[PDB]
Design a protein around this ligand. Structure first.
Ligand SMILES: C=CCNc1nc(N)c(C(=O)c2cccc([N+](=O)[O-])c2)s1
Length: 294
């Protein structure tokens, strides 16, 4: 490219292909994301550009928004490995508890920061949580969903993971809140602990029913207004809530209580990132260094 040198394709992102690139004039290595047509919405460019101002140790920095030759690219700081790969790599022994606790703590800090700045992510998943050799973890892509109009599927004819989608989204609610990110993070927390996805749905209804079979089919008592959600159906099977100690064994009671507050059905009852940072679970949090194979 005119201003970069491709090092390799890193993967397929929500909004387009992502490459590990080298800046032609600086020599710096970055994550270059090509945004997948109409004419590159102007509202999106202005809105995304505002995100360049976000700076926090737990948020992947957006270095630039490049609009040239009528194509759009997002330039991000390049991190060492993603949480999906790290979890896969730690499958045999599992991620040590102190490291799980540290990552969760840092992710909540990133969420608290973004949410305090009126920015939501809406699509948190292991793939956009990036780690480095020093023990930090950062969230990438905050604010892109609101700015863009997340297409049903990628122009790559691939597949979109639904595993971390909040129930209000699955029920067709078109108004998002900070709670959708707490739900996703809760799902990720459970996955780090058990070494298996909490709700690995293969479709939206399967995703929804997997949640119902574990936490119980929601009703007006635990979630006022649920029966009026866009895609709610009175014909949904009525599953009883499962013993929560069966959900994420063998995590201790502080971890289980915090997780239960991150997974409340009613977005309004779901714990905020700020309040979660004060939960007793983090009383002994530290910052361990991960064993990363690059
Ligand atoms: C995976 C480690 C390489 N270093 C990276 N560094 C960054 N900043 C990456 C990303 O922001 C990212 C986020 C979601 C999906 C993909 N993606 O390529 O599909 C890439 S990836």
């Amino acid at each position: 490219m005119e201003n970069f040198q491709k090092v390799e394709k890193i993967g397929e992102g929500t909004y387009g292909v992502v490459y590990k690139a080298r800046n032609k004039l600086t020599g710096e290595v970055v994550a270059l994301k090509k945004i997948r047509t109409e004419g590159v919405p102007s509202t999106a460019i202005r809105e995304i550009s505002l995100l360049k101002e976000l700076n926090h140790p737990n948020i992947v920095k957006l270095l630039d928004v490049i609009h040239t030759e009528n194509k759009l690219y997002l330039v991000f700081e390049f991190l060492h490995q993603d949480l999906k790969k790290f979890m896969d790599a730690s499958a045999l022994t599992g991620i040590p508890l102190p490291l799980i606790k540290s990552y969760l703590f840092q992710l909540l800090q990133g969420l608290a920061f973004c949410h305090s700045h009126r920015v939501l992510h809406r699509d948190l998943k292991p793939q956009n949580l990036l780690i480095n050799t020093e023990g930090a973890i950062k969230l990438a892509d905050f604010g892109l969903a609101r700015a863009f109009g997340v297409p049903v599927r990628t122009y790559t004819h691939e597949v979109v993971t639904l595993w971390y989608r909040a129930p209000e989204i699955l029920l067709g609610c078109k108004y998002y809140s900070t709670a959708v990110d707490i739900w996703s993070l809760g799902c990720i927390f459970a996955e780090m602990v058990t070494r298996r996805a909490l709700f690995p749905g293969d479709s939206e209804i399967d995703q929804l029913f997997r949640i119902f079979r574990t936490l119980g089919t929601p009703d007006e008592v635990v979630w006022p207004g649920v029966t009026s959600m866009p895609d709610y159906k009175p014909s949904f099977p009525k599953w009883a809530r499962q013993d929560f100690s069966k959900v994420v064994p063998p995590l201790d009671e502080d971890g289980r209580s915090l997780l239960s507050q991150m997974l409340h059905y009613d977005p309004n009852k779901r714990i905020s990132a700020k309040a979660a940072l004060a939960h007793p679970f983090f009383q002994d949090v530290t910052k361990p260094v991960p064993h990363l194979r690059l």
